[PDB]
Specification:
heterodimer, A: 7 helices, globular, binds guanosine-5'-triphosphate, binds guanosine-5'-diphosphate, binds magnesium ion, GTP-binding (chain A), enzyme regulator activity (chain A), identical protein binding (chain A)
């Protein structure tokens, strides 16, 4: 059982990347609302389950003009899963128990700005003590190598000077070394096949998803497969126990 | 000759880069921490007295309900200063520098869906204030398979909400077909770059990725050539004329009705 949360501005290719990680179309009938409906659109929660994986999406995030309670619907869901597990752990049927606690949250940073918006800082500072945050740079094929390194160094500095507790990798040797150096991962996703390979077609060249010299798709996928046991371990031993002690304040 | 361009886009969407691409000359990036939307104006002498006004901090605040207000405030301030000129007894129209915005290039983030709610509201309240030309910023983020669908959804968004966008004049028969082509390509998929590379054997603005090099002046790569063809003496004066006879006339009707 693993639970992956997806948070980010609409239109960042989050659905495409998720369908690219496992080659599973999870949004066959999803409809995108018009710009008039996004004005007052609220944040909703959709959970898709495939096989022991659950992808928790948060459609509506950032679409509203006035983020009234943009984080509240997400924060309360994370706390709800901690509360349900808490009351099931304290129950008498601990044998048959479902662990829906969010083990990892992919947050999609826009590549079209200079760094990260205040919305990114507020959201991460709101959940970094509750979920393992893995920042990702959406639509990496819009950044040159020079532009890509400028954005990664800026995001990491802003993370440090805002004290963002993102998920950290632990300490074969070349795998861990190159994986840590590419954080934050700048990924490219695709459902198209193009002399045939998965990627995106432009008049001036073809981007390859599984090409590490083009984007960090393979690194993100490799990091998730290898650190999947550690992600849920930090969730159970750190984020859940902090919620449990904070719950006992009242 | 006075001509004033307004650039309205989210922070980092390439406003300064695109202006440098249009005129082949260098003209600072804003932060994302601005508590409100402001505007920066700079006038250049090139025959032509160009003024470039850019939004600062547009779209960065968590609450974006008051984003259109500073832009409308600035446009009205130019409408008001011109009205003050017509009401002077001993006026100096012949020597007055027209500061009214003659064109607004609205930068749309290449999301691939349609319009954001901030795009719909801001453009709807700039309808009767300025000649709006919608462009898809950083168009190299969209494959040609998606650009066709994206342009259709955007236009369907402007029509359904009654957004009044500028249309190049087809009344002049001497350049009606080429203006009919530019109107059919709206919104313009534009790409900008402040550095050139040797493609073929002519230095031209470009963006090089590990998988290819984008040619800015190549019509098959983006619609930048279409956007540059708005600087023709005929289309450039109509934007100045359509501002005075339509948008500025609307400002007078409101100031007189009281
Ligand atoms: N992918 C892509 N990147 C671009 C394009 N144009 C510019 N850039 C990059 O994006 C960065 C932003 O450029 P700016 O011109 O400063 O953007 P801006 O809208 O003026 O930013 P502010 O003035 O602070 O609001 C530039 O440094 C370029 O490296 C483009 O057409 N496509
Ligand atoms: N440039 C770029 N565009 C992408 C990528 N992945 C998806 N897209 C495009 O982005 C548009 C919307 O993406 P989507 O997956 O629906 O974004 P979502 O709103 O987060 O679900 C689609 O037209 C995709 O073709 C990518 O890696 N790079
Ligand atoms: Mg700029």
């Amino acid at each position: 059982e693993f639970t992956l949360m997806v948070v980010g501005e609409s239109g960042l290719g989050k659905s495409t990347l998720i369908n690219s990680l496992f080659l599973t179309d999870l949004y066959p009938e999803r409809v995108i609302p018009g710009a008039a409906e996004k004005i007052e659109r609220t944040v909703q929660i959709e959970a898709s389950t495939v096989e022991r994986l659950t992808v928790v999406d948060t459609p509506g995030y950032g679409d509203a003009i006035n983020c009234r309670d943009c984080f509240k619907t997400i924060i309360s869901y994370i706390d709800e899963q901690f509360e349900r597990y808490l009351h099931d752990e304290s129950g008498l049927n601990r044998r048959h128990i479902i662990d829906n606690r969010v083990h990892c949250c992919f947050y999609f940073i826009s590549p079209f700005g200079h760094g990260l918006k205040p919305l990114d800082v507020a959201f991460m500072k709101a959940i970094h003590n509750k979920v393992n945050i893995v920042p990702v740079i959406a639509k990496a094929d819009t950044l040159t190598l020079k532009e890509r390194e400028r954005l990664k160094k800026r995001i990491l500095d802003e993370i440090e000077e805002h004290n963002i507790k993102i998920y950290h990798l632990p300490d074969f040797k070349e795998q861990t070394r190159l994986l840590k150096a590419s954080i934050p991962f700048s990924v490219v996703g695709s459902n198209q096949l193009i002399k045939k390979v998965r990627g995106r077609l432009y008049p001036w060249g073809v981007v390859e998803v599984e090409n590490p010299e083009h984007n960090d798709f393979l690194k993100l996928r490799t990091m998730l497969i290898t650190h999947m046991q550690d992600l849920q371990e930090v969730t159970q031993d750190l984020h859940y126990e902090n919620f449990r002690s904070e719950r006992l304040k009242r | 000759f006075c001509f004033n361009i307004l650039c309205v886009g989210e922070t980092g969407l390439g406003k300064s880069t695109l202006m440098d691409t249009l005129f082949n000359t260098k003209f600072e990036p804003a932060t994302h921490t601005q508590p409100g939307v402001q505007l920066q104006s700079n006038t250049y002498d090139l025959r032509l007295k160009l003024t470039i006004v850019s939004t600062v901090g547009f779209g960065d605040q968590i609450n974006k309900e008051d984003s259109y207000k500073p832009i409308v405030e600035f446009i009205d301030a130019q409408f008001e200063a011109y009205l003050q000129e017509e009401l002077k007894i001993r006026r100096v129209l012949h020597t007055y520098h027209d500061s009214r915005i003659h064109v607004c290039l609205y930068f749309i983030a290449p999301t691939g869906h349609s319009l954001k709610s901030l795009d719909l509201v801001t453009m709807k309240k700039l309808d009767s204030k300025v000649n709006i030309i919608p462009i898809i910023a950083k168009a190299d983020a969209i494959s040609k398979s998606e650009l066709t669908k994206f342009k259709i959804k955007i236009t369907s968004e402007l029509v359904s909400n009654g957004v009044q966008i500028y249309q190049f004049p087809t009344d002049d028969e001497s350049v009606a077909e080429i203006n009919g082509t530019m109107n059919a390509h709206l919104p313009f998929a534009v790409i900008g770059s402040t550095e050139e590379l040797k493609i073929g054997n002519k230095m031209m603005r470009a963006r090089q990725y590990p998988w290819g090099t984008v040619q800015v002046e190549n019509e098959a790569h983006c619609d930048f050539v279409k956007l540059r063809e708005m600087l023709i003496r005929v289309n450039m004066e109509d934007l100045r004329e359509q501002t005075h006879t339509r948008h500025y006339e609307l400002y007078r009707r409101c100031k007189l009705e009281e």
